[PDB]
Amino acid sequence: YGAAVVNIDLNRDFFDTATGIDLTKGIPLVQDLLVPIGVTAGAEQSAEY
């Protein structure tokens, strides 16, 4: 009695945080698979989606 919001997403268990991906935001974010070769320092932070 008193739930503000419920919802559906990716199970933070089958997709473990250690050996594979990560989910703190909604998007399942992995580190370095497709990094844009030649840009500034703050870029590529979206190509990790």
Added chain:
Amino acid sequence: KPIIERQGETVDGLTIIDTSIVWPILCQCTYPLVE
């Protein structure tokens, strides 16, 4: 007096173009690879 004319190599490296300067730039030359 012309602006371009025939002459042998000058006392400076501008005449006689070396053509061997191709293999180093295909092997022994790291680029910024694209910081």
